[PDB]
Each structure stands twice: as structure tokens, then as C-alpha cells.
Design a protein around this ligand. Structure first.
Ligand SMILES: Nc1ncnc2c1ncn2[C@@H]1O[C@H](COP(=O)(O)OP(=O)(O)O)[C@@H](O)[C@H]1O
Ligand SMILES: Nc1ncnc2c1ncn2[C@@H]1O[C@H](COP(=O)(O)OP(=O)(O)O)[C@@H](O)[C@H]1O
Ligand SMILES: Nc1ncnc2c1ncn2[C@@H]1O[C@H](COP(=O)(O)OP(=O)(O)O)[C@@H](O)[C@H]1O
Ligand SMILES: [Mg+2]
Ligand SMILES: [Mg+2]
Ligand SMILES: [Mg+2]
Lengths: 57, 371, 57, 371, 371
């Protein structure tokens, strides 16, 4: 049973680490798109601020 | 050959070869010293971090600006800055390159004389020239008349020029500049519970000032809106987290320019000084000066500053006079662009101060008519 | 030795599941912020067009 | 010649030559004396058993540790330990080998003074140097920044280093260590039926702690699980029989590090002291310290301690920072590896305290720049 | 009716009726909580001890200060402190007595607003007022012009006043105070072998600092004398025994005030901040400010501090300008004396913040002209 548990541990660690590299890639790409979303959000924000100041003047 | 256009300014050195569209090397003008001892041996830390490198080591360095208000107070630090600019940022030996320097109006003569002496002696440049930071800005705008307001980090000044003829008796200088605004922002941010004391975090406060502060078209109405609503509050992310939200302080910091009394200075606001300068000139050129207002310097980059300045000056000026304010997107680098344009002129090649001339006639050449 | 290996693998897979839940709420928050950023930017787009027409007239 | 790196530490003396990948000699720092009379005539038992040999005769000796928390309390015993290390373990004459010694931060100056005096006079070492545990631990980790938490058997201290520059005002020390954990394990084992009092059984309890104890990610959940399930119970074999089974006591002993209130200490857990030390430092380096947290010392070898520490710090720290904990497999011998690396450096050869300097300036010379 | 004057301070609350020569209720501002179990039943133990009572049970309680640096960081504790002051030490119902409070300059607005809200809501006083400590100190001294240095236990600050007019832009605030000195004394006492960690030992260290510490006229000379001779060794007796001996660190602790770099702080010493403040003002009042330097606060009672500060300022100041330092013997209670005097004025009776005014205007009423 110790050897059986060792085999269980080895393929369990293999599957979980495969999922870990998958999730690492996922979080990296989602953080990249998070940065992009923040940049576009602030871009629209201050563009609208400037055009609104132009409108009021 | 080619000419180097160095603009020391204050808080930002920008330099590059003449004839280039934009400056090649731009970096803060600070000197950093390690305030700790260092335990790890063998690293061989240098005793002084100069330029942009000091910005990456703010947490273990004390930063000193070699320029307080236009003038140079620490000559060794300025020499280090110049050496770093010549040998690292540009990687060009100054032995065979004339240099053009810029400085604000109404400065001590000893400053200019010592700058010239250091440049001819330490670096041995073949020739050098000195210019006013306002005339170059006027060149960069493709104009020949009007007044120029150069609000940098150290000093602000107004210089009226008509048809290429400067009017020395109407030049106005005020010591309020970006550094004082940063200090005021540090002071007033305490009321919200945020304390900034170390020189390193002064740079942080400067970053918030650049990113969030803006000029209000009207003061009382904006105060009322901020006190009633909360739509003007914005949040900034500090280098170590704990995002902080600033509201009413957002537009109070840049108002010091129009309200010097906030920081205790008795002098009048920027618009009032400009108006007084406008009338300090003759009466036959006031219309053109009104119609050709020029802005330059980083401090004039606040959003909405142009509209407020136009409104104030129109209120002061007679109704039947057209008022226009020129605010190109590239205010910050306008002075360097003008200097590059001037250095590329063919007729200017005879205005350089040759090394032989300086040696024969001494350091006082710059002040003499051979300007 | 086998029991020690199994214990370490079990700890690793508990912590891998814990980071997985962490990643889960991270996707939740980043998805909601991406959605709100998109909405505010596109609303800025409509109002920018409207104020631009107003400015022209 | 070659340099000699010796680490007295606390509870384990480890020594070897510089440039080696691991200490050659490692043995407990224990001095034992016989407490009985002795009837056989002719064997001629020695009056003092020192080092690992005392472990063999553990059952007829009164083991004493020469040092309580870093500070040496029995100087004669320390001299015996050093003599045994130099002669019976390394079999070398210290007359021709410079010695590098390791000493914890924030200790009485008399300690270092007496250490250097003994080394220079009793053993006539040609030269010697004294270093801090944290710097060596950082050296061995291949890092130049970060906050290092060194938790041995005597004292647990956190030291932040940034770009090779220390932050003395942010160094934190806590007297909780492995010895207190062993004492608490004795105190908590008695509630099940096993009583350990004699100093000989101290070693048995320590071995049980090393072999069975582990850190729980959650305390309340683990306690609830153990209250019902019996899957956490493990058996241990005493050196005579009568195996003993321990249940929840295995993961309760190491909780004292995070819950010092168990043993009456007022201070906070290590996870909180680390965060406090990080917030002591300047704001501009907190991100790097967060991302370069280093662990060292034997007491940090408990399974699952790294995950618990990371979870606690992440809870304390802002959610926008990546908290990374570095736990190399060889935590116990990290300090000695760092000392070997430091001694192997060429530029370090001029930092030794030579015999002439000690003779000229007396024992106090240790407190000069040759810290 | 009569008005109450309460000075919360930081770690020392002093309160009394207005129109008295000295406060009649002085006690530390600490809240103690029992950290142990408690075996005896029926003792009726309380779950929170406040004020001087907690000083008598330091060995079974954990002590918390509700004020870190001027700012109140725990409102429940401060409420308990105020209730104890009003109902036990003074034994007067607050429902029929105006209250005058004091706070340091540049204090966060939220702190003052919450103070006023709690004061009006819980204790339901008819009127209340808040004042800056510097102005009260000036009133107590009998002067009307001169920069005042108020170094308390939580914060130090210099405020210039000329002819009854304050200069906000010249107010300087530094966070170095008595608490930091106590912490530094703790840190440096370990150099001899005395370890103080638990909060109870903080009071012992503070008492040692009060009794023995003194300011040296010169640092290098005194250190040389201490290292050479042994005439500065002084012995203190702990609550139990094992009298401790103190040498150079007797005067090294207060040097942090003039040398903040000891504790890693960037800012300069008080002797330099005072000069910077003096130079920050106008030019035509610098003489009077130089000749009317006023000291206040508990931290400014180190024997010889006045002479050292005078020497430093004279070194900094021009030769032809005379420097005078005023150090009344009742430095600690000067703020309360000034507050009582101010409350005694008949004119000030019209500056009270009536309860109806607060109800109709809300908390913001505090920041309006009724400053
Ligand atoms: N967009 C901006 N908003 C606010 N402040 C700005 C902005 N751009 C530049 N500044 C300020 O301008 C200063 C730089 O001035 P600069 O033009 O370099 O003067 P000089 O030419 O004398 O060096 C900086 O201190 C910065 O705070
Ligand atoms: N695998 C382990 N698990 C738990 N504790 C351990 C382990 N190995 C060693 N220790 C503890 O570490 C201590 C040794 O610390 P050490 O590294 O010698 O400190 P120092 O370097 O100050 O001598 C021992 O007392 C022991 O209790
Ligand atoms: N003779 C003395 N020597 C050294 N320190 C003193 C002396 N007298 C008072 N102190 C310090 O002054 C502090 C009290 O300051 P205090 O005036 O109460 O400030 P606050 O009013 O803000 O509480 C104490 O913490 C103590 O350490
Ligand atoms: Mg400029
Ligand atoms: Mg160790
Ligand atoms: Mg006070």
C-alpha cells in the first residue's frame, strides 16, 4: 500500500502541476488584458474630460 | 561639425545634437548619495549615483538637486551632471563640439562666469554660447512677437519681445515654480492622513501632482461641487500598495500660481503679472502682445490652465482687445527645440565664443558685448 | 520514505487547490473590472461623438 | 594558506575549511559531566565529555549548553568546545589558519570582545573576522536584496538588506527559538501521560519534535479534524521501548512561533514581526522585500511552514503585491555556505583583523569599521 | 460656571479647571487589558484598566497607547480615557461645563471632526473649543512674539508668531519625540546585556531615561572622556534589584534629537529645523524671533539641552545677532497654563462653539472661522 500511495502521489502531482502551468499561463494573459483594459479606460476617461472642457468653454 | 544643445534647466536635463527634431537624452537633475553603510563586501558600490540611475535607488539614497532656483548652488554636483550627460547619455567627447547653454533672465553674473570657466577648463569645449530660455521658446513657436511665459520647475518669468527687439525693462521674474507646488502638495496632503517627509517620496508626490492635479476654471464653484458631491475624487496607487484617494486637493495645488498667498508669497498671481508686464511696454504694441501670448515649461502643462489664463486676462484686459493663448502640445521641450533651431542657423556660426578669445580676454567675455 | 512522499504530495496538492481558489476569485474580479471598463469606455465613445457634433455646430 | 570557517551557532557547532560546499564537522554544542561516583578502578574516566561523544554517554551525564540565546554564559565550556572542534574534529593547528566566526545581531559588545581575545590569545590564530548571520545567509541564497529571517535554536531575527545596504533601524530580534519549542513540547506532552524531566530526555524530546512535528496551515480546522478523526496520530519508539502515540500535540508545538502567547511571551508571531520589519523600511523598496523573502536556520525546517507564512503575509500585505517565500532545501547549513563564500572572496583578504592590529589597538578593535 | 481644560497630549493626559495655577489631574494615557486567564472566582476583575491605575498592574496587563503621533488611532480607548478623566479624576459632570482641548499643528481634519462629534454626542457638553498647543505655550510664557518649540511625547513642532500673527507657511513638524527616544534607549541598552521587550518594561526604560539621561554640550569630547575615564558611570536600581550601570549611552540617547540619523530618519535635528523655520519667515522679524526662542513640552527638560541648542543656533546664525533661549522651569505644564489663561479671558467667551451651532452646521463647523 505504501508503493500504491507513492504511485497515487506521483500521478496526482503530475496532473496538478500540469494544471498549475496552465493556470499560470491563464493568469498571465488575463493580467495582460487587465493592463490593456485599464489603459483604454483611462484613455477614454481623460479624452472625455478634455472634450467636455472644450465643450463648456 | 555638429553643435550640442544642452538645457540644464532645473530638475530635468535635456540634451541632444543640434538639428534634431527632439532632444535625445532627457533625465532628472539629481545627485544621490548612500545614507547607509553597506554590509555586503565585494560589490564595490560607487559613492555617488547621478541621473536616472538615482531614480531606481531612491530607497537607499538621499537626493539633492544642484539647482535651487535657476542658479547653481553645488558646483561639484553640477560638474558631475555635465560629465554624465557628455560621457554616458550622449557618449560623445566634447573636445570637438560647440555647446549652447540656456539660463533664465536676471541671474547672478557669477553663475554665468563660473559656468563658462568650468566649461572651457574642465571639458575644453572648442566654443560655447549662452542664451535666454525665453528667446529660444519664441523661436520654437515660429513667431517673432508677443510675450512668452516660461514656467519651469525652478523659476517662472515673462519676457515680451516685439519684432525681435527685447524689452528688458518689462521682463518679470517670479520664484514660484513646480518645486513650490510639490512642497505645497506635500503639506496639504497631511490633512487627509498621508505623511510624506523623506526626499525619496517627494518624487512620489511629484508623480501624483503630474498625473492627477488640474487647474479649475472657477475656484468657488469647484469647491462647492467638491464639498457637495464626490465625483472629483480619484485614487492613485503607491509603489507599495495602499491606494490613496484625493479629492479637493486635486485642484488646490495648481491654484497657487493664481493665488500665491496660499504659500505666503506677497507677489501677485501669474495672470496679474502677465497683465502688468503687458502694460509695462509701450502702447503701440499692446495689441500684438495680447494676441500672441506664448506658454512654455512643464508647469504650464496642467489641464485647463490655458482656458483659466485666457479668462483671467480677458477680465483684466479691455473688452475690445482680442486675446489668444498659444499652448502647443510640446511645451516642455519647446526651449530645446528653439535652441536646436538657433544652433542650426548659418548666421549664428560667427556668434560663438572661441576658446582663443576667452583665453585672451578672460572669463568676462560672455558679459561683454561679445555676448 | 513512501509515507513522507505521500504527505508532501498531499500538502502540495492542498496548496495547489488553495491557489486555484485564489485564482478563481482573481478571475471573478478581473472579469468584472474588464466588463465595467469596457462599458465606461464605450459610453465615453458615444458621449465623445455627441459632444464632438455639439462642438462642430 | 587557506581560511577556516567555524559557526558556533546555538545547539549545533559546524566547522570546515573555506571554499568547501558543506561543513566537514557538525556536532551538538554540549558539555557533559558525570553525576555518579564510579566504582571500577583502572578505566580512568575523564572528568568532562564534550561534543557528539557526550551523546553516546547521554545516560550518565548532566548535559549543559554553554550558550543560552547567542550570548556565551560559560566561557570555559566554550573554550573546551573550540579546542575539540580545532583538534579532535578538524585535526588542524589554528596557528596558520585565519578564522571566520559568525555572531547574531544585537548582542553585548563584551561577547565579541571576549571571543576575539580568546581566539587571539589562547589559540594564537594569525587573524580572525566576525560576521552577521543574516548577511551570510543572503550570500548563500544567491541574492542581493530581500528580508532574511534566520531562526536557529537560540534566537530568531529578521534583517532586511537592499542592494547590499542594511537597514539597522529595521532589524528585529525575538528570543523565541527551537529550545523554547522543545520546552513547550515537554510541557504539553505531560497532559497525555508522558513525563520528561532529566536533561538527558531533553534530547529525546528534541528528536521527537524534529521527526514528527509539523506546521498546520489552519489551526482551528486542524484542531476540529483531530477532535474527531484519529488519522493525525503517530507513534514513536523510545530508546528502550514503550512506543508513545501523539495526536494533535504534533502540530501544536510549532504553533508557538505564530502564537507566542502560548508560552506567555508578549511579542507577536514571526509572521507579524516580518511584516512590521518590512513596513519599517523605506516605501520605495517594500515591493522587492516582499518578493524576496528569505528563510534560514534549522527552526524553519518544519513541513508546511513556508505555506503558512505566505498565507499570513498575504493576508497582512496589500492584495496587489506578489508575496514569494524562498525556502531552499538546505536551510540549516545556509549560514555556513555563505560564510565559506565570503571567506573565499579575494577582496576580503584585506578585511581580516591581523594580530598586529589587535596588539596595537587592543581587544576593542572589533568595533571599528571592520565590523 | 467654569470651563474645563483637558490636554490629551500623547501618553500623559493633564486636565483641570480653568483659572488654576496648575492642572489637578495628571496621569498617563494608557489602557491596560489582562492577558492572563485568572483563576480566582468572585474577584470581580475588570476587563479594562485606564489611567494611573494601570501603572500599578503593569505585570499582569498589556498596555496600549491610544495615540501614535498626535493622531488618535483607537477611539474606544480615547473615549474610555475621557470618561475616566471626567468622572473619576475630576469628578465633575461634563453636562454643565465648556471644554477646551488642544492638538498639534497639521493634524488630519478627520481627527478633529471625530473629536468634536464624540465630545458633543457622548458627553453632551454645552460648548467646546480646540486650540493649537504652540499658541497656548506662548500665552503661558507671557510673551507675544517668538518661535516656540513644543517637543512632546508624540510629536515635535516649531511655530513662529510675531505680534500675535502666526505664519502657517513656516510651521515645521517632526515626528521625533519622547517615544522614539525611549525606543532607541531600549535598542542601545542591549549593548550591555539588559533586554527590555514587554510593554511593561517600557515604563522602566522611560523612568531610566527621565532620571539619568542628559544632553552633552559636545559629542566627540564626551565620548572620548567616557571611553578614557569612568566618571560618567551611574547606577540605577530596578524594581527588584540587579542594579544596572549606564555609561556613555546615558547621553547618547538624547543626541537623537540633534542627530536623527541614529534612528534612520532623513530629517535634520531640531537645532537645524528651528533655524530653517527662522529663515523661512520674513527678514524684518528675524531679530525678535532670534531673541525670543521659547521652549515647551516634556521632552525639553534634559539637563543642558538649552545650552547645546544655543550653541548650535549661534553657530548657524550670523555673528552680529544675539540668540536667547527661554526655558521656564514649568516647561511640561506650560501648554495647560496657557490654555487655562486663554479660557479665563472674558473675550474668548464669545468664541465658544455652541451646541446649537454644531447641530445646525454639522461637524464642519469646527473648520470655519471658529478655528
Ligand atoms: N503634465 C504635467 N502636470 C503637472 N506638472 C508637470 C507636468 N509636466 C511637467 N510638470 C512639472 O514641470 C517640472 C519640470 O519643469 P522643466 O520644464 O523641466 O523646467 P526646467 O526646464 O527648468 O528643467 C516638473 O517638476 C513637473 O512637476
Ligand atoms: N527537520 C527539522 N524539523 C524541525 N526542527 C528542526 C529540524 N532540524 C533541526 N531542527 C531544529 O533546529 C535547531 C538547530 O538550529 P541551528 O541551525 O543549529 O541554529 P544555530 O545555527 O543558531 O546553531 C535544533 O534545536 C532543532 O530543534
Ligand atoms: N526630565 C526628563 N528627562 C527626560 N525625558 C523627560 C523628562 N521629563 C519628561 N520627559 C519626557 O516627556 C514625555 C511627556 O511629554 P508630555 O509633555 O506629556 O507630552 P504630551 O503633552 O504630548 O503628552 C514623557 O514621555 C517623558 O519621556
Ligand atoms: Mg526650464
Ligand atoms: Mg544559527
Ligand atoms: Mg503635548
Amino acid at each position: 500500500e505504501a508503493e500504491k500511495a507513492a504511485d497515487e502521489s506521483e500521478r496526482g502531482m503530475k496532473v496538478i502541476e500540469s494544471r498549475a502551468q496552465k493556470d499560470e499561463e491563464k493568469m498571465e494573459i488575463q493580467e495582460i488584458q487587465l493592463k490593456e483594459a485599464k489603459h483604454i479606460a483611462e484613455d477614454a476617461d481623460r479624452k472625455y474630460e478634455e472634450v467636455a472642457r472644450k465643450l463648456v468653454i | 561639425t555638429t553643435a550640442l544643445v544642452c538645457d540644464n534647466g532645473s530638475g530635468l536635463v535635456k540634451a541632444g545634437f543640434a538639428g534634431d527634431d527632439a532632444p535625445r537624452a532627457v533625465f532628472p537633475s539629481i545627485v544621490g548619495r548612500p545614507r547607509h553603510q553597506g554590509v555586503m563586501v565585494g560589490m564595490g558600490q560607487k559613492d555617488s549615483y547621478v541621473g536616472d540611475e538615482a531614480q531606481s535607488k531612491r530607497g537607499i539614497l538621499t537626493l539633492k538637486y544642484p539647482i535651487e532656483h535657476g542658479i547653481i548652488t553645488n558646483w561639484d554636483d553640477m560638474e558631475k551632471i555635465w560629465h554624465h550627460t557628455f560621457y554616458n547619455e550622449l557618449r560623445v567627447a566634447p573636445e570637438e563640439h560647440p555647446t549652447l547653454l540656456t539660463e533664465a533672465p536676471l541671474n547672478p553674473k557669477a553663475n554665468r562666469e563660473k559656468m563658462t570657466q568650468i566649461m572651457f577648463e574642465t571639458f575644453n569645449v572648442p566654443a560655447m554660447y549662452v542664451a535666454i530660455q525665453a528667446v529660444l521658446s519664441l523661436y520654437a513657436s515660429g513667431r517673432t512677437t508677443g510675450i512668452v511665459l516660461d514656467s519651469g520647475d525652478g523659476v517662472t518669468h515673462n519676457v515680451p519681445i516685439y519684432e525681435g527687439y527685447a524689452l528688458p525693462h518689462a521682463i518679470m521674474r517670479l520664484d514660484l515654480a513646480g518645486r513650490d507646488l510639490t512642497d505645497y502638495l506635500m503639506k496639504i496632503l497631511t490633512e487627509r492622513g498621508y505623511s510624506f517627509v523623506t526626499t525619496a517620496e517627494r518624487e512620489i508626490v511629484r508623480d501624483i501632482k503630474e498625473k492627477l492635479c488640474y487647474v479649475a476654471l472657477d475656484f468657488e464653484n469647484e469647491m462647492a461641487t467638491a464639498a457637495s458631491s464626490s465625483s472629483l475624487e480619484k485614487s492613485y496607487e503607491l509603489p507599495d500598495g495602499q491606494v490613496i484617494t484625493i479629492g479637493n486637493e486635486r485642484f488646490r495645488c495648481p491654484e497657487t500660481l493664481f493665488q500665491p498667498s496660499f504659500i505666503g508669497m506677497e507677489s501677485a498671481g501669474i495672470h496679474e503679472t502677465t497683465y502688468n508686464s503687458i502694460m509695462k511696454c509701450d502702447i503701440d504694441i499692446r495689441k500684438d502682445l495680447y494676441a500672441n501670448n506664448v506658454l512654455s515649461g512643464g508647469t504650464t502643462m496642467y489641464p485647463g490652465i490655458a482656458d483659466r489664463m485666457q479668462k483671467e486676462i480677458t477680465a483684466l484686459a479691455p473688452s475690445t482687445m482680442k486675446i489668444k493663448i498659444i499652448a502647443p502640445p510640446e511645451r516642455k521641450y519647446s526651449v530645446w527645440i528653439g535652441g536646436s533651431i538657433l544652433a542650426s542657423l548659418s548666421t549664428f556660426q560667427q556668434m560663438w565664443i572661441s576658446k582663443q578669445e576667452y583665453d585672451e580676454a578672460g572669463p568676462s567675455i560672455v558679459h561683454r558685448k561679445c555676448f
